[PDB]
Enzyme design. Sequence first.
Site, PDB file in Angstrom:
ATOM      1  N   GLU A  35       0.631  -0.637   0.347  1.00 20.55           N
ATOM      2  CA  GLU A  35       0.380  -0.084   0.287  1.00 20.55           C
ATOM      3  C   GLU A  35       1.301   0.998   0.638  1.00 20.55           C
ATOM      4  O   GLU A  35       0.709   2.273  -1.122  1.00 20.55           O
ATOM      5  CB  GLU A  35      -0.823   0.120   1.642  1.00 20.55           C
ATOM      6  CG  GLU A  35      -1.873  -0.932   1.276  1.00 20.55           C
ATOM      7  CD  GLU A  35      -3.147  -1.009   0.458  1.00 20.55           C
ATOM      8  OE1 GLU A  35      -3.091   0.379  -0.171  1.00 20.55           O
ATOM      9  OE2 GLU A  35      -4.051  -1.532  -0.099  1.00 20.55           O
ATOM     10  N   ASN A  46      -6.851   8.637  -6.494  1.00 18.08           N
ATOM     11  CA  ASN A  46      -7.535   7.962  -6.746  1.00 18.08           C
ATOM     12  C   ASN A  46      -8.475   8.568  -8.071  1.00 18.08           C
ATOM     13  O   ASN A  46      -8.710   9.398  -8.674  1.00 18.08           O
ATOM     14  CB  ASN A  46      -8.591   7.340  -6.040  1.00 18.08           C
ATOM     15  CG  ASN A  46      -7.782   6.807  -4.569  1.00 18.08           C
ATOM     16  OD1 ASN A  46      -8.172   6.732  -3.769  1.00 18.08           O
ATOM     17  ND2 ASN A  46      -7.717   6.304  -4.816  1.00 18.08           N
ATOM     18  N   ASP A  48     -11.012   8.183  -8.970  1.00 15.87           N
ATOM     19  CA  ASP A  48     -12.587   8.436  -8.315  1.00 15.87           C
ATOM     20  C   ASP A  48     -12.530   9.415  -7.977  1.00 15.87           C
ATOM     21  O   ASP A  48     -13.829  10.527  -7.163  1.00 15.87           O
ATOM     22  CB  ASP A  48     -13.760   7.716  -7.716  1.00 15.87           C
ATOM     23  CG  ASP A  48     -12.573   7.140  -5.878  1.00 15.87           C
ATOM     24  OD1 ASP A  48     -11.612   8.198  -5.843  1.00 15.87           O
ATOM     25  OD2 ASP A  48     -13.409   6.536  -5.633  1.00 15.87           O
ATOM     26  N   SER A  50     -11.358  10.631  -4.303  1.00 17.88           N
ATOM     27  CA  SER A  50     -10.460  10.726  -3.590  1.00 17.88           C
ATOM     28  C   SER A  50      -9.245  10.300  -3.281  1.00 17.88           C
ATOM     29  O   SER A  50      -8.844  10.382  -4.912  1.00 17.88           O
ATOM     30  CB  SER A  50     -11.378   9.094  -2.863  1.00 17.88           C
ATOM     31  OG  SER A  50     -10.895   8.509  -3.660  1.00 17.88           O
ATOM     32  N   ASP A  52      -5.573   8.206  -1.107  1.00 16.27           N
ATOM     33  CA  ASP A  52      -5.350   6.991   0.314  1.00 16.27           C
ATOM     34  C   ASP A  52      -4.535   8.186   0.684  1.00 16.27           C
ATOM     35  O   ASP A  52      -3.039   7.941  -0.107  1.00 16.27           O
ATOM     36  CB  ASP A  52      -5.134   5.944  -0.556  1.00 16.27           C
ATOM     37  CG  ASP A  52      -6.386   5.036  -1.238  1.00 16.27           C
ATOM     38  OD1 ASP A  52      -7.238   5.582  -0.252  1.00 16.27           O
ATOM     39  OD2 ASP A  52      -6.033   4.439  -1.800  1.00 16.27           O
ATOM     40  N   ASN A  59      -9.294   6.220   3.242  1.00 18.07           N
ATOM     41  CA  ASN A  59      -9.233   6.154   2.079  1.00 18.07           C
ATOM     42  C   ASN A  59     -10.582   8.166   2.260  1.00 18.07           C
ATOM     43  O   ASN A  59     -10.710   7.941   3.504  1.00 18.07           O
ATOM     44  CB  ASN A  59     -10.466   5.843   0.719  1.00 18.07           C
ATOM     45  CG  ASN A  59     -10.980   6.598   0.096  1.00 18.07           C
ATOM     46  OD1 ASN A  59     -12.014   6.497  -0.152  1.00 18.07           O
ATOM     47  ND2 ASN A  59     -10.232   6.166  -1.448  1.00 18.07           N
TER      48      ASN A  59
HETATM   49 NA    NA Z   1      -8.540  13.665  -2.702  1.00 19.41          NA
END
Ligand code: NA
Length: 129
Positions: A35, A46, A48, A50, A52, A59
């Site tokens: 990770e 990401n 999307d 968001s 991480d 997230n």
């Molecule tokens: Na963000």
Amino acid sequence: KVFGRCELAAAMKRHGLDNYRGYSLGNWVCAAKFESNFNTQATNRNTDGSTDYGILQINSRWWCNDGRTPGSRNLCNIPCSALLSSDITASVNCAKKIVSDGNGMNAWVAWRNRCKGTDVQAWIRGCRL
Ligand code: NA
């Protein structure tokens, strides 16, 4: 902070992650390797929208607030920047909540795709028992 592998294993153990929800410590070290490469400062935006954050790539749509993610639920009630600290306490406390949700460690895509089903004991080789 870039953790040593055994340094992180010790820190995670201190916080009670060993066997938390049945996941042995090597699972958690393996997850962190893939990770964040053991780097507390790691951030990844990401597709999307968001991001991480930190050692366990928590997230901003579900778990922490970063001020820029539409739909943010902030279920860990923490700013995402707190997850970047050299102190992994906040990341561990939020991970405990995450792993307690329905899918367990499958919430960590790197764990699912790189750790699950493998010899995760290898990730604690050499670390104090
Ligand atoms: Na963000």
